Every structure is written in structure tokens, then in C-alpha cells.
Design a protein around this ligand. Sequence first.
Ligand SMILES: Nc1nc2c(ncn2[C@@H]2O[C@H](COP(=O)(O)OP(=O)(O)O)[C@@H](O)[C@H]2O)c(=O)[nH]1
Ligand SMILES: [Mg+2]
Length: 177
Amino acid sequence: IRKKLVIVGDGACGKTCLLIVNSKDQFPEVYVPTVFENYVADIEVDGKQVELALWDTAGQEDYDRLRPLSYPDTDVILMCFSIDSPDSLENIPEKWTPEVKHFCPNVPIILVGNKKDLRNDEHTRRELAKMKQEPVKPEEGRDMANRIGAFGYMECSAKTKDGVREVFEMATRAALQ
Ligand SMILES: Nc1nc2c(ncn2[C@@H]2O[C@H](COP(=O)(O)OP(=O)(O)O)[C@@H](O)[C@H]2O)c(=O)[nH]1
Ligand SMILES: [Mg+2]
């Protein structure tokens, strides 16, 4: 019934907005805190009633120094990149995976691709095209999930709310395990 979630991944990949949406059911359009803190989510996940504490983290450089304090006792990690940022995805196996395996060796990981609303967005496609990039594809996220040993790969959009609910239900399932 009481479970701990930690969410990690590159600066600006949409972690805080994802937690705010899960929690308050509305995307923050103007103000967004660096970290959304102290929130316990009530989740029903079939059978029990879970209280899922949501522990947000950050970088932007020095928030680096505190992040380690987030991992004691976690039950489930959401490890994020954004679908508008091929760069964010390479950081998964390069940075976030070693960091989390180090601090939380056997805790289940859900790999999440955030900003799914941008995958056909015109300005995004233009901006990436100029670098000979394109939005991350679902196949890529699934194979990264495979590679790093994740419990599963999911996509969502905090902006439209599509897929958010399912992220937290699967994380809750994972944490119960
Ligand atoms: N298009 C779009 N932008 C989003 C989405 N989620 C967050 N953003 C924007 O992405 C930027 C970073 O968000 P934030 O949650 O602070 O990321 P954090 O540094 O990972 O916590 C902000 O400008 C958010 O509005 C999303 O689902 N879709
Ligand atoms: Mg943040």
C-alpha cells in the first residue's frame, strides 16, 4: 500500500510537468517549479489501493549534489527522456542507467518517453530536420527499454494528458512486485 517512486532524466525532459499532471490533473501552463515535492498519489491498481510517493529530482548542474538523497527505499523508477530530443535518449544508457543501477540495483525501471504530442508537431519537426534529426520513434524507446533491462517502455504527453494515467498505473504495478 505505501510505495516510493523516483523520477529521473535530463533537464527539461518534462519530469515535473508529468508529476504535476498526474497529481492535479492539469498541465501547469505558466509557472513550473524545478521540482514538484511532497506529494503522495492515491492509485487503485487492480486489487489494492496504493499510496505512491512521488519524488522529483533535477540537475541544471548543482541539484546534482542532492539527487543521491532521493534514492534510499525506492520501489520504482520512472526514467524519462523526451520524444522531441534524441539527445535525451542517448543519455538513458550513458548517464541515467549507470546512476540508477548504482544507487537502486534491483528496483524496477519504467522507461518513459515524454512530450509525445511533439512527435508530429511542425516546429519540432523543422527544428530537428535542420540537424538531420527526427523525433524519437516508439521502436527506439522499446529497444532502449530492452537494452537497459527496463520493466517496460511507455509514452505520454503531460501537455495533452494522453498516456499519463497509464504511466503511474504501470509504475504502481511495478512497485508492488
Ligand atoms: N510539448 C510539451 N511540452 C512539455 C511537456 N511536458 C513538459 N513540457 C515543457 O517542457 C519544459 C520542461 O518541463 P519540466 O517538467 O520542467 O521538465 P524537468 O526539467 O524534466 O522537470 C517546460 O517548458 C514544459 O512546459 C509535454 O508533455 N509536451
Ligand atoms: Mg523539473
